[PDB]
Design a protein around this nucleic acid. Sequence first.
DNA 1: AAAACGAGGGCCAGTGCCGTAC
DNA 2: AGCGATACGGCACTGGCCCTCGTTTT
Lengths: 983, 363, 358
Amino acid sequence: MLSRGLHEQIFGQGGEMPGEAAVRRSVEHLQKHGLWGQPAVPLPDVELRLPPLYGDNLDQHFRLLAQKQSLPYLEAANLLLQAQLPPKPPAWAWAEGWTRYGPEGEAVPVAIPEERALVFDVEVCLAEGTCPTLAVAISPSAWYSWCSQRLVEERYSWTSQLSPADLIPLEVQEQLVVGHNVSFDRAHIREQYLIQGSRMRFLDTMSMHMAISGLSSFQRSLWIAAKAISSWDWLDISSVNSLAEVHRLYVGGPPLEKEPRELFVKGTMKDIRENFQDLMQYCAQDVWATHEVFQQQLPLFLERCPHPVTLAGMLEMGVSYLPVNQNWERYLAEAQGTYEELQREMKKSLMDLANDACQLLSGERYKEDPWLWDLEWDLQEFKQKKAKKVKKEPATALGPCSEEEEFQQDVMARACLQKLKGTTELLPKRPQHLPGHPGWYRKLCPRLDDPAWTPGPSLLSLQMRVTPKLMALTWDGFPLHYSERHGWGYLNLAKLPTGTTLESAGVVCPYRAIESLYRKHCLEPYNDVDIPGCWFFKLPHKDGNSCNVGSPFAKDFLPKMEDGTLQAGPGGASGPRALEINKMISFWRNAHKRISSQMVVWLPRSALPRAVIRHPDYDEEGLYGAILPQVVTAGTITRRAVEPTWLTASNARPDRVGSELKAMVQAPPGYTLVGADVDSQELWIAAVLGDAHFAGMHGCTAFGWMTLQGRKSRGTDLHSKTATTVGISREHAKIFNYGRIYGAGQPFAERLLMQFNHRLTQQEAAEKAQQMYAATKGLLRKVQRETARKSQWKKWEVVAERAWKGGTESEMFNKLESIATSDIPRTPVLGCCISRALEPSAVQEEFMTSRVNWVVQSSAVDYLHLMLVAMKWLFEEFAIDGRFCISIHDEVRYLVREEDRYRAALALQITNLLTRCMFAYKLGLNDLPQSVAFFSAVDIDRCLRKEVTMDCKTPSNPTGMERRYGIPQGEALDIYQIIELTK
Amino acid sequence: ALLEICQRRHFLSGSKQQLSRDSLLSGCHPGFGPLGVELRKNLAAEWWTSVVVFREQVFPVDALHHKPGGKLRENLLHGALEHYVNCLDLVNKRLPYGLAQIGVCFHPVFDTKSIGEKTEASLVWFTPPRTSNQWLDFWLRHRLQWWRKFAMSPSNFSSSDCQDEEGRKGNKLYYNFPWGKELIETLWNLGDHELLHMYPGNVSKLHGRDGRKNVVPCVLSVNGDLDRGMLAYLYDSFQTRKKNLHRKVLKLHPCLAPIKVALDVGRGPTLELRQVCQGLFNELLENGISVWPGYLETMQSSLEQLYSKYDEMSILFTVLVTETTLENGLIHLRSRDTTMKEMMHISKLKDFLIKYISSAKNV
Amino acid sequence: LALLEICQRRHFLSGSKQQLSRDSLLSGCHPGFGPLGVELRKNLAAEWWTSVVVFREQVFPVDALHHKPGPKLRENLLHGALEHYVNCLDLVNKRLPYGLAQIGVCFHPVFGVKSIGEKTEASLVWFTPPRTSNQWLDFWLRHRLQWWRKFAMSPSNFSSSDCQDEEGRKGNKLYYNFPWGKELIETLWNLGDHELLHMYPGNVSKLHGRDGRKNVVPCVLSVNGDLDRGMLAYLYDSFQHRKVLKLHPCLAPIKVALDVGRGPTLELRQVCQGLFNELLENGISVWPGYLETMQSSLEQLYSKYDEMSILFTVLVTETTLENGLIHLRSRDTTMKEMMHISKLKDFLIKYISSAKNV
DNA sequence: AAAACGAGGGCCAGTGCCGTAC
DNA sequence: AGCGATACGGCACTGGCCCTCGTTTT
Ligand SMILES: Nc1nc(=O)n([C@H]2CS[C@H](COP(=O)(O)OP(=O)(O)OP(=O)(O)O)O2)cc1F
Ligand SMILES: [Mg+2]
Ligand SMILES: [Mg+2]
């Protein structure tokens, strides 16, 4: 009820648009494909009073919303554009707080620079951060320079107070701040940290550049190489995201100079004040360049991204907010302790193995070792020079009692000792590393004059290349090696010759202990090169490999470690345990810096909502604070969020160490976060882009039907339907699908599916060939498929037909390619063009995959923006306290309160529905399916995570530490209307 | 189960043949050797450091061995509980706070009629009821951590969560001996029962300021057998397939090792400026590092003999003084962890030893 | 006198109201010790083991059982040292005259019904040939008297007496003037081989050790000192309107204390915690009066820290959070000084190492 | 007596594999 | 035309510039 799926909507009476021939072709396509065994399972239809629509369509609804949400800021930006610049002051004021430079650059002591808008770039002495030190900001009126309290020499104590720069104006419109990487500056704003607020938004010039003329990482790698036939025509129309480069791109003025000493990161606070004037001047150059760049970009961005939805979406996307407490510091301490412990254990074991292996140096018995013979085994003893003379040899030149009368013979021996000491010091010079020990052991030791010297051999690894060979047995064999790749592994007769000769002088190579080790192994070049394992003699070459890269070292082969082959000795289960230790600290090793350095400002009990103090939680002399995620508003591709820490933040695994990082964002008492994850967006997007191109309805495609058919709740989605083949659930199948949509390479799908299912190559290849049906088919000498009915002809002139290309049958890749052929903007829908560097105009363009991905991921990001502006629209219109946003591409979480959580979740469902209807309306028809209209999951609890039920590693017990529980949602939230008076 | 000869040959233990696993686990052993009691000395000191000194609110308590009213004390927890009020007066009623003590205890044992004594390091942690299980978990993790270091294989030391007959939660610490696991330390959460029984009259003098309110203190208790611990490290230190070449050496952690360095005389014979050895001796002991004196000797034997003799004593480094060093000033050195000759200067050797121990104490 | 009362309010001894008399303290009967007394005793024992570990050539540490090996508690600390004689003959390679030291809790009966008392004593059993026995006995007399003299505030308080009898050929006893009555602190005897020959007959061919190509059963020297009596001795030696205990720096339990002066601010606590860590990192016993909670007067504070024999008192005011300057205050001179916080560790360490002299 | 050349180690940036998220 | 895509970092390894010290030079 009806048309195989629709709901009661007031989004337009008409409508069909029947397309009888089209739906006949679609039904005929879905019968021969063929799917005609409908399950006929109608979802419970929902009847509720929709919020006021402003008409006519929802396009103009979202447009008016996005415009009114971004109008004051647009006015402010226009105040920045038509700004007449007052020149830089002759000298900078060395005073705390703000200084206003107006007429002739005089110094006017000011607490807060009251302006509608300004550019900004804060400075921070990294030597003892992360506390702001210098700032410069220009305004359409005059200049401003802010100095921190670091003008007086003290022995401060940084617990991150409300010392960051003040910028917001008090009430008892309004603000806009632009700047290069504006989020970092935002993180140094005094009033941005408050639980409430804020009127002030930010505009990122970097994000803007990325939206206008951005480029991919691959494009960056060869852009900087400037120091594939028509791949060099975009080299001068775009640039990397550096400030100097983007200024030289948009302004094209003189190359701005960068600080040659890098004093803010290389030097201390001492050498900053000595060069205060100059550093100030540098900051001024930066904010000026930023201003010019902004002035030039705003109209360009407004042209290329005409829809205000993207504007407002980019406005709210910058003002993220993460509330936390003392449990953060506890998390840091505990996780770091765990890490140091496991590392202590691992390094202890490894250095123990390295120590007992250092004994076979005497005498020359290392040549017999099948693992230890490539390395140094050096023996040094240097050095001295002659100063004493002459002509005599210095190499050879039971009585009981009780005497003590020589009371001072002790200080005699002492004097002899000290006199003997300070006369050898001039014999050597610079203390070198321990020569007595072999070279491989010297390298595996810290220097003696090193401030962080640890005893014995440190610097053990995991993932090094000496130690894995130091112990491990190698795949039913004995030796492992390295040259262009390590031991070969994971990621009609053939023969190869052998040879053995001597000529002197190289290093001795044993190959008997190898054979005998093989004997000992099977005690429980050819043949045995295919499935079994063995090593030849010398050569060296592949002779039976599958991976085209190699892998130093085997750090994710636990099922190929806890199944026999391969193993280690000595010995036993030390191998699998070592791999376990590695897997555990894998995350924290490459993140601990970003996490521990991740700053956070604490707000005192004076500047917090007393409505929280009233709530039965203080808590026991507890400190409450927060951190702004510091996010680049738009990064390629397409204009997504880019953040060093929180976007690459590990999820909740009972294995990883810092796996709780995601669940450490704990909402203040009285408050609770309500969020949701789109399930799914990219798949359904591709689907819609297929069926809206094929016909008018939503299920007129082979691919676009299975998408909106399965339900994740007690059912089976498309991902879950491919995961149960089998098949592996569930993220793996997702990777297989989204990998298939953007280039399902036969060997890639091969080694991937074979990596995920763990079976044999033949049956796997069969499954792949079975699934490769979706992309099939496709199109002098050529592929035997064209527009003519047969390929064979004789001198038939048809070069005018070799311009069409597109797959057939199941998928809809033809539309994704259709948007990838247009030399004009390519923006669906909405509706923003990107990069003068990926536009096929004056580009080869040979970057197809990146462009298809750009299409669908842009649909995802426009989806995101729409979700944002929608959520904001019904959050201010109604009495919903807590508008602060926290989003990760697909997922989005709002910081609400415990009494408005259900109505907020309702707002989420509304938002999702309206956005889906928008994507439907932008292609026709406005009618939309059922099992895609509303969120299946809506999380509502104190801290944010993935599922409602959360366990962990480091704290072991989650609810053991002060926590609560989550709640799935749902169908029960559909009883509280958007009106304030519910329940 | 054959390193016993190494314990008798070099006195970390008694030389009596009657030293069964039972005789050692019970505490009925004749006594430990000098190296043994020094090993236990350093282990106990390392307890004292990472338990009492570093953590505030923790103070040493002197409990008696008997009762004024024959059999002795079975645990030094009670004698510590007796000193609660005064030690409440010195901390100004600011709990949580603890009392630690390393004392020898006497256990009655029926040999299948005797009595076995064993040294135990007990800490009694007076903590508010609101934070009992949290401090129990804390001390569990930190005791287990303190025992898992020093180890050449921390995988042996394990923990077991267990409950009382009443319901009180507690944890036990095990070490994996070659014949199975064995209890080495016991952690329990006593619900203020004993203190209430000790002070029936005025329960007011027991109230401790949790913060904004005075509460009756819940009593945490951790008792660690340092004898069984000493034996555990002694076993862990000793080595195990396809090694191709084996040497007898126990690898004790450089911190708790009985004898740090070993000073000798080489080439040999050389008279008589060998008084410098005395100098290095007193200089070394002045900085508190154990140094074995190789002066009066009957060997006069292969260097491998006394090298193995020092590796059977887990001596970290072997410093050698010869006449060429009497000439310039670069003595010889041989590490235990990695048997290798290395030349070094004198004060540089002293400071290298100090830095070796100090940095070994770290990560 | 008024010394026993300031050892109660400052916790050198355990809480008592009737068994706080001089006689009950001289007796092993306890009311054991307060934390201060425990630390004083531990430092004292550390210095004892130090004053006998610097001794050439080698003396081996051992530990004896407390109960009777055959079913009872120990009176002396000699038997246990004698049992490990034959064993420790191997380690010295039977080469020279040698000794065995040990510090332990020994018991003695105290006289309604009769009870039992405890005393923690340190003993040394020195095996030496009969010919050089007496000479070495005098040597040990000198070194021990000097040992008690080093940490003493007055060397005339410690006395040395000679004596002998039929069983012991020559013996010496170390007394301590109080002066409410000179008391016994340490005994030095020269027991013959009879004691040793009584528990190993025979075949006594094991007992005689080499003395320069000579087989001879060694005469036994019995050193036996009391560390409780010694503790009380130094306590009475340190007692000096002023009521200040001036214990020796190396011997003093807590040697420094630091509080705050400015009103209860988190930053002060941060700085004080920093100094706490820095000082404990270099082995310096420090009392944390910055907890605090009130920091009342400064005079009764200094009085408290003087009755606790604290060497230096430190004050961390609000000015410290600017210049780094801090208020030092001595005990032996009570001079109110001021200095930078970074150079505190070095000053303390140097002051402690300067007291190293004999 | 004094000028010059080669060996050793640190600071530097580039490169290859791996770690996570969506 | 052929294809995993958008990122964010880490550590291990390396060839090259630069300074210091010694072996070799009026
Ligand atoms: N390999 C992937 N490439 C992608 O571009 N994506 C993302 C970019 S945004 C959008 C979010 O994907 P998700 O990770 O949340 O996965 P999904 O929502 O599409 O599917 P599901 O609902 O999570 O089962 O597709 C995800 C991948 F896993
Ligand atoms: Mg999803
Ligand atoms: Mg997602």
